[PDB]
């Protein structure tokens, strides 16, 4: 009975040792499901905003990648309209050696360094590619509209 040791430990390490700029709460019903809040990274157009992310550890974790998705609307060339995140280590570059902590920091790093060149989304990426100044201003606008409460 119970969760695998690794999941017990990783569930727990969060609460004893939160990542800088990230908070997590356990779901009230599902022991593999977490409600995360990521602070917009320093010096990004997301700074000052807070972004909800949901995380789920599937049956085959850690052989299988954790699943994550934004639940706050965000203007970013690597996050789609439904919050899905294009990040290599979430698919095909996942490895069991990686930990939840490192996944979350990698998502923070994505917010800190958008990649319009290899974009989810081509609408937003095209804007980020061709009018980056406007795209950054729009990212700030959406932070004001959606990530301040």
């Amino acid at each position: 009975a119970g969760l695998p040791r690794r999941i017990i430990k990783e569930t727990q390490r969060l609460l004893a040792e939160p990542v800088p700029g990230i908070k997590a709460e356990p779901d009230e019903s599902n022991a593999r499901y977490f409600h995360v809040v990521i602070a917009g990274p320093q010096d990004s157009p997301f700074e000052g905003g807070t972004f909800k992310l949901e995380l789920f550890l599937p049956e085959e974790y850690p052989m299988a990648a954790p699943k994550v998705r934004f639940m706050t609307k965000i203007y970013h060339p690597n996050v789609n309209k439904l919050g899905s995140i294009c990040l290599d280590i979430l698919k095909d570059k996942w490895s069991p050696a990686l930990q939840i902590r490192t996944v979350l920091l990698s998502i923070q790093a994505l917010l800190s360094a958008p990649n319009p060149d290899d974009p989810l989304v081509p609408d937003v990426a095209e804007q980020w590619k061709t009018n980056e100044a406007q795209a950054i201003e729009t990212a700030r606008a959406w932070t004001r509209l959606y990530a301040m409460n």
């Binding site: 599902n30 949901e54 934004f70 639940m71 309209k81 439904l82 899905s84």
Partner: protein, 140 residues
Amino acid sequence: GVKVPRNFRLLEELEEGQKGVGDGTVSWGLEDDEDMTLTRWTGMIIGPPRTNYENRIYSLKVECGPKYPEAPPSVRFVTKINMNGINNSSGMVDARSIPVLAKWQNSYSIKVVLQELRRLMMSKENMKLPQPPEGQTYNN
């Protein structure tokens, strides 16, 4: 007994909807492509052959509430239909009258609901019902 949370289950359903299933006689997708809550879906059923529904495309609204898939979704036809279990003035599907809804299980999905409604269109008690003119829709 590892439960997949609502939002991740609905993402699986979104992907399956995009890929399509079977012979394509039912289909489903999100009503609003920006709805991060994945709550409101459009369903489509092709009326089955050799029934009075034949050669008609039915549009439906399927709502997956906060407890889906532990709880069944709510379903209503937008396209007008005369069919047992469907309120003939509003299009609302009466869960008690549709076995997949009345006996919902958390293994079911939007696909299963639409396939059930299409199967029920073939029943002796539905296949002969005279239908409204094609194309009409309910209010709201």
